[PDB]
Nucleic acid binder design. Structure first.
Ligand SMILES: [Cl-]
Ligand SMILES: [Cl-]
Ligand SMILES: [Cl-]
Ligand SMILES: [Cl-]
Ligand SMILES: [K+]
Ligand SMILES: [Mg+2]
Ligand SMILES: [Mg+2]
Ligand SMILES: [Mg+2]
Ligand SMILES: [Mg+2]
Ligand SMILES: [Mg+2]
Ligand SMILES: [Mg+2]
Ligand SMILES: [Mg+2]
Ligand SMILES: [Mg+2]
Ligand SMILES: [Mg+2]
Ligand SMILES: [Mg+2]
Ligand SMILES: [Mg+2]
Ligand SMILES: [Mg+2]
Ligand SMILES: [Mg+2]
Ligand SMILES: [Mg+2]
Ligand SMILES: [Mg+2]
Ligand SMILES: [Mg+2]
Ligand SMILES: [Mg+2]
Ligand SMILES: [Mg+2]
Ligand SMILES: [Mg+2]
Ligand SMILES: [Mg+2]
Ligand SMILES: [Mg+2]
Ligand SMILES: [Mg+2]
Ligand SMILES: [Mg+2]
Ligand SMILES: [Mg+2]
Ligand SMILES: [Mg+2]
Ligand SMILES: [Mg+2]
Ligand SMILES: [Mg+2]
Ligand SMILES: [Mg+2]
Ligand SMILES: [Mg+2]
Ligand SMILES: [Mg+2]
Ligand SMILES: [Mg+2]
Ligand SMILES: [Mg+2]
Ligand SMILES: [Mg+2]
Ligand SMILES: [Mg+2]
Ligand SMILES: [Mg+2]
Ligand SMILES: [Mg+2]
Ligand SMILES: [Mg+2]
Ligand SMILES: [Mg+2]
Ligand SMILES: [Mg+2]
Ligand SMILES: [Mg+2]
Ligand SMILES: [Mg+2]
Ligand SMILES: [Mg+2]
Ligand SMILES: [Mg+2]
Ligand SMILES: [Mg+2]
Ligand SMILES: [Mg+2]
Ligand SMILES: [Mg+2]
Ligand SMILES: [Mg+2]
Ligand SMILES: [Mg+2]
Ligand SMILES: [Mg+2]
Ligand SMILES: [Mg+2]
Ligand SMILES: [Mg+2]
Ligand SMILES: [Mg+2]
Ligand SMILES: [Mg+2]
Ligand SMILES: [Mg+2]
Ligand code: NA
Ligand code: NA
Ligand code: NA
Ligand code: NA
Ligand code: NA
Ligand code: NA
Ligand code: NA
Ligand code: NA
Ligand code: NA
Ligand code: NA
Ligand code: NA
Ligand code: NA
Ligand code: NA
Ligand code: NA
Ligand code: NA
Ligand code: NA
Ligand code: NA
Ligand code: NA
Ligand code: NA
Ligand code: NA
Lengths: 56, 237, 83
RNA sequence: GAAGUCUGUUAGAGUUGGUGUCCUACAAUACCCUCUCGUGAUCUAUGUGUAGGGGUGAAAGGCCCAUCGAGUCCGGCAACA
RNA sequence: UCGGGUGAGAACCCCGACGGCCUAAUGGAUAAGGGUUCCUCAGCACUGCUGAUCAGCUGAGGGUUAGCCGGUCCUAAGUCUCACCGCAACUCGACUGAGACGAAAUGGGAAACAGGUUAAUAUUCCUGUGCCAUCAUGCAGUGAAAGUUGACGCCCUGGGGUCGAUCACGCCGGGCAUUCGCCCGGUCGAACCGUCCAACUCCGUGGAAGCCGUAAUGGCAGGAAGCGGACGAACGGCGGCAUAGGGAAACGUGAUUCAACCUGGGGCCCAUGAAAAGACGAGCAUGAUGUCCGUACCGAGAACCGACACAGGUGUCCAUGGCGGCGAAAGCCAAGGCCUGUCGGGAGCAACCAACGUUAGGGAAUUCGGCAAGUUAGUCCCGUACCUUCGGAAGAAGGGAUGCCUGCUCCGGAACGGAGCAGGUCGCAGUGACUCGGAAGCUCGGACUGUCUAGUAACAACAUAGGUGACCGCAAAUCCGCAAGGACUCGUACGGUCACUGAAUCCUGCCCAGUGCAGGUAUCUGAACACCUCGUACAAGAGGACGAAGGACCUGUCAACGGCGGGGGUUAUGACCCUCUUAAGGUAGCGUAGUACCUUGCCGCAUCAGUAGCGGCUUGCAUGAAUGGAUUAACCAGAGCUUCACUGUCCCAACGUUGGGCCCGGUGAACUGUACAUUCCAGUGCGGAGUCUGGAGACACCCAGGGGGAAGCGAAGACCCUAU
RNA sequence: UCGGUGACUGCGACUCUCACUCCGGGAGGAGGACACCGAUAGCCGG
RNA sequence: UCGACCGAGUGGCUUGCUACCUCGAUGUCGGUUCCCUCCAUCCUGCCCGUGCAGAAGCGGGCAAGGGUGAGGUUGUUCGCC
RNA sequence: CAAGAACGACCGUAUAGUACGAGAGGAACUACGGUUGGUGGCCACUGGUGUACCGGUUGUUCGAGAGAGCACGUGCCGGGU
């Protein structure tokens, strides 16, 4: 079976959903963790210095 | 290279775990207060999916119902006894001290009250040899002479289901079904049939270990494969 | 004789077929019940034996009700009865 | 009435030859005929676990979202020749 | 397709007729997913492979009603939170404890049916009827928690039994009918309440010493049959519900086979087939309460995923519509759906191409190779070789039969079930289409079923049972973690782990020198602390004594890594003694090998001819014993060869069929492009020029073609070298 | 430099229990200054 | 008719040498199909010599108009039959 | 002016059992007949096709009959302008 178009047909699974905390559709309804803001993982908001260039 | 299969095992992921949730009972000698005996009646005999050997349901006097490791020749309605004063009959559990020398014995404790450790598999037994107020000498199924506290409890008789290994599996499918009931990864790819990255014996234009198979005790995981700390190999000599 | 091993057709080779027949032949023999003495004992499963006559259910070997090891137990007790 | 038994486009699974059709495609792995398995180490839905020098691998360096002799994203980074 | 409707406009929007397509789907109900796409009105700038008055498009408005269907509750594999502990630390981490989460088709589970209704919802609204839970009241009880249930695998099978389908015979309505009298549809009616009970189990009676019983197993003086009884099913029968409802009407009796549903018997396991909430146990009547969330529609060749109205991908239920037949097969046809796998018009419609049909004579001559195609085919009777692990081989091979009609026989309770007989009779052909094996032999490999390179490899590769060796007594061996801790393990040597070989059969020789592992070790070597000496008012530092593991040294071990030659003495294969390197010096076998350079080795088979194939020989460039040797029945989309049969593969091509191609209306891209460019023959040039040089030829433009050239287009060469 | 006698320490041999470890519900039992753990030294360690 | 040694050449079909052209690619071998050519001529036409009786040959000259086919082994070119 | 190979080649008979030759054996000029390869055309003849057409017949549907549809672009078989 081709890993391309034929395998695309099975994707009816909901994972990432609108998050209660940040509003992004990053809340992974199977993990109960938001990949954007960290909700369900962290009380503190998810943030990283690598999200911007080092000198700003 | 990559971690070898024996290294994947230790992580305890699903593939390598026993199907514990399908298992019936952890088989341990019931605790008796002290200086006492306690009796129960055998209510049923059932299959033990962890052992491929039968197990006996016993209903005790104080009301407690539990599965026990069953020696051969135990049947529904039989009365079984556990304690210092118990009768000497197949299926009873007593301290090694109270057991006649020369009697075959099973589910032997390594330390007193541990529920039993040795000679638990199909058809096997330990042979009680020597007594003392100090030491009980027991011969284990491997042939080893084991010095044990005489207060270590054992069950009289040989474990049930003897002869299990007399019949060949004959086919992959039969092995398969057994392996599902175990904490094993199966089937088994030969290391020599793998790539170098995957195993010390992997690689080459033809299949061969490309190094001696006898490996030092001191070898690290990922390197310790083939014949471990072998004192000798082969048949002859 | 092929015995019960006929279910295998031409597969698996001679030792395996022979041993499965022999083992299954003895397994399927009339077995005398330890309780009533009648020849009505059958296998219910691995190591598990039952009498169709008196209903007695008991532990035995995997493929036969009684093993050489188990036959020794009974003796070793009496030999230790009188030291 | 047994069988990792046989025949079988029952369902379903698989993918040998045609080196056919297609090859700015209907399609970033398709179409047709042919072919293999089809009570079992079987096929399958949904839920669930294992995470990157790590997993998973009946072992082909196969697979881990068109990405694999070390995924992807952003950063180191205006890498160095 | 013809005719019509609407409209400014109609091939494709709608009506009728005629003609077709789909039958596990192109029909009916749904899960996920989508999210308003659903319905109505008004539209055509956008989207729609052409057009559009149509629309999943644009704009506006409307639409989803529940005690009984789901959620909700329960627990599953698991997951999270808190506590504890770890970590430099945490949003990180394993255990333990507590708590919570974790199933919408498809786990468990209190209770709903029938009719009616809307443009669009309905077990939800309306009508009628029923049912459950909780609470309150009253009567009873005061029994109440033991138990039962929830609650369970795979294979075979009996009984009960509804729908459906079919048969027979009535009734109602329809069709056909220049002849026959046949053909189609209907003939209804729920949940629920009540009642009946077969199987299993049990009791009493009885008293079998060969009887009882089954599809089969089986049963019994430890009490068989028979007789009597207790307990005890169906989504089933029967009565009510119902002068309810539905139907234009009639508004039905019997039967057979019997999905559903109920209830039994047998067999299998180195495999043992959830749990919890809940229910029953535990009465009746009358009232009250039953909140919250979901509900439209699609569910796909246009509503999902694949950038698209994408020929791909995507779960469940309807496995009982008719003929057919073994059949959920083919073919044909209902019900239901569709003409939207959505551009049309024209030309005997050329060449050329796709996919096909037929092809005289020959019959594999084609080709690397029968690649492609063809042959055979269903069922019954006869008959069936070598080989073999006695199972197979086998549908071996080979031979014969096969329809219709008339009258019958046999098995069976019977079938609209099956097996036969006699007579008649048509065709070139009776498995008349459809469905539906070509066969045989020799060799190689892997024993077999199984696995694999999602996307050029399906194989001889991996796996496998089987064989073997290694480690380990469990405070273990092996493995994960920084730690706290953890997998194996609800496990215990008939066990786990770690490796090699790879079914069966006959076998598996010699070598421990090197390397590896392991054991031992007088002596030698062997670090640091402490100790002793020297040095330093201390220290650095120099030396000594002692001596762990390890090493030297010794030994064991090849189904450990691996090895098995060179050169010489002396009755097929060959024998024995030696020597040298470096321990041994190739045994049984097999052998020009999937291993053999020489090589198309030599001899033979086979062919007109055979680098092939097979057999024999065999000094083997460079075979050989679990780096397993030999060999082997069965199996195989595996490699090679031979034969019969077959045939357009070939001689050698022809004609035909369907879709294109060609012309016309409409829609309408891309690749590519330094410039110039009508070239050709020669030459020259960085040695492979349309463009330079010399000649030759050359009026311009356009259509169709097959692709000689532009070292054609496509890709900063994978080969090769170079890069500190 | 001639011997009864503290303490220190090199050396290899031994017994205890009281830390610490394991078994046990407990009472207690088995080990035991070892092991675990922390630090360091030598050997092996694609 | 065969013709050694030695000497002089012609071709550009093999092989070798060179590294001039292309590494921002001039698609491999063998085969096939279809077209044109060369002559150092295998047959055919016309000739010369003969160790030319004839017949059948052998050797040579002119000559490229036409022909030069089918099969068995091998991927083979070649070659063997 | 342009193109053509528009033809190439072989066997047989008469010549002749002749010339030649001891014999064995064994020609030619010329005139005829045919074959093969190539070439251009043609369709009375033979052959192929011929989903124009006509017939037979299986399954199914239209109630039977009659007459028809489908079975891949003829269901299959027989004949064929
Ligand atoms: Cl096992
Ligand atoms: Cl729902
Ligand atoms: Cl039965
Ligand atoms: Cl070819
Ligand atoms: K190049
Ligand atoms: Mg991928
Ligand atoms: Mg976003
Ligand atoms: Mg335990
Ligand atoms: Mg084994
Ligand atoms: Mg078996
Ligand atoms: Mg497992
Ligand atoms: Mg293996
Ligand atoms: Mg490999
Ligand atoms: Mg390695
Ligand atoms: Mg091997
Ligand atoms: Mg090997
Ligand atoms: Mg099978
Ligand atoms: Mg099959
Ligand atoms: Mg392609
Ligand atoms: Mg899954
Ligand atoms: Mg590789
Ligand atoms: Mg609409
Ligand atoms: Mg307009
Ligand atoms: Mg409208
Ligand atoms: Mg759980
Ligand atoms: Mg929940
Ligand atoms: Mg449910
Ligand atoms: Mg609706
Ligand atoms: Mg109410
Ligand atoms: Mg709806
Ligand atoms: Mg469409
Ligand atoms: Mg045409
Ligand atoms: Mg022909
Ligand atoms: Mg033939
Ligand atoms: Mg040939
Ligand atoms: Mg050929
Ligand atoms: Mg073929
Ligand atoms: Mg009869
Ligand atoms: Mg060969
Ligand atoms: Mg195989
Ligand atoms: Mg592939
Ligand atoms: Mg394959
Ligand atoms: Mg493939
Ligand atoms: Mg293998
Ligand atoms: Mg093995
Ligand atoms: Mg083994
Ligand atoms: Mg040969
Ligand atoms: Mg030869
Ligand atoms: Mg050996
Ligand atoms: Mg030049
Ligand atoms: Mg010029
Ligand atoms: Mg480059
Ligand atoms: Mg390279
Ligand atoms: Mg390295
Ligand atoms: Mg080119
Ligand atoms: Mg010349
Ligand atoms: Mg010429
Ligand atoms: Mg037709
Ligand atoms: Mg036919
Ligand atoms: Na290797
Ligand atoms: Na295919
Ligand atoms: Na990585
Ligand atoms: Na970067
Ligand atoms: Na650099
Ligand atoms: Na249209
Ligand atoms: Na009823
Ligand atoms: Na039918
Ligand atoms: Na199979
Ligand atoms: Na050695
Ligand atoms: Na050695
Ligand atoms: Na060897
Ligand atoms: Na296979
Ligand atoms: Na043809
Ligand atoms: Na061209
Ligand atoms: Na050259
Ligand atoms: Na270039
Ligand atoms: Na070529
Ligand atoms: Na010529
Ligand atoms: Na040849």
């Amino acid at each position: 079976t081709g890993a391309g178009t034929p395998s695309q047909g099975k994707k009816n699974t909901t994972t990432h959903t609108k998050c209660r905390r940040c509003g992004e559709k990053s809340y992974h309804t199977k993990k109960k963790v938001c990949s954007s803001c960290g909700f369900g993982k962290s009380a503190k908001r998810r943030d990283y210095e690598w999200q911007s260039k080092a000198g700003e | 290279g990559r971690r070898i299969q024996g290294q994947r095992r230790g992580r305890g992921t699903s593939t390598f775990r026993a199907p514990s949730h399908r298992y019936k009972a952890d088989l341990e000698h019931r605790k008796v207060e002290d200086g006492d005996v306690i009796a129960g009646t055998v209510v049923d005999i059932e299959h033990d999916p962890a052992r491929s050997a039968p197990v006996a349901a016993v209903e005790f006097e104080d009301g407690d119902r539990r599965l026990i490791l069953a020696p051969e020749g135990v049947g529904v309605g039989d009365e079984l006894q556990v304690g210092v004063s118990a009768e000497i009959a197949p299926g009873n559990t007593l301290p090694l001290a109270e057991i006649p020398e020369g009697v075959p014995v099973c589910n032997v404790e390594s330390s007193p009250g541990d529920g039993g450790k040795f000679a638990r598999a199909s058809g096997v037994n330990a042979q009680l040899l020597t007594h003392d107020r100090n030491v009980a000498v027991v011969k284990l199924p491997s042939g080893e002479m084991k010095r044990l506290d005489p207060q270590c409890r054992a069950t009289i008789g040989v474990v049930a289901g003897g002869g299990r290994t007399d019949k060949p599996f004959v086919k992959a499918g039969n092995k398969h079904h057994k392996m599902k009931a175990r904490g094993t990864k199966w089937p088994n790819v030969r290391g020599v049939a793998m790539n170098a990255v995957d195993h010390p014996f992997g690689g080459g234009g033809r299949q061969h270990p490309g190094k001696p198979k006898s490996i030092s005790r001191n070898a690290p995981p990922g390197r310790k494969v083939g014949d471990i700390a072998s004192k000798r190999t082969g048949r002859g000599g | 004789k092929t015995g019960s091993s006929g279910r295998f057709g031409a597969r698996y080779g001679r030792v395996s077929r022979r041993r499965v027949a022999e083992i299954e032949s003895e397994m399927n023999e009339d077995h005398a019940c330890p309780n009533c003495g009648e020849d009505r004992v059958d296998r219910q499963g691995t190591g598990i034996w039952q009498c169709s006559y008196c209903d007695y259910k008991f532990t035995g070997g995997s493929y036969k009700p009684e093993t050489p090891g188990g036959k020794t137990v009974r003796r070793s007790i009496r030999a230790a009865l009188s030291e």
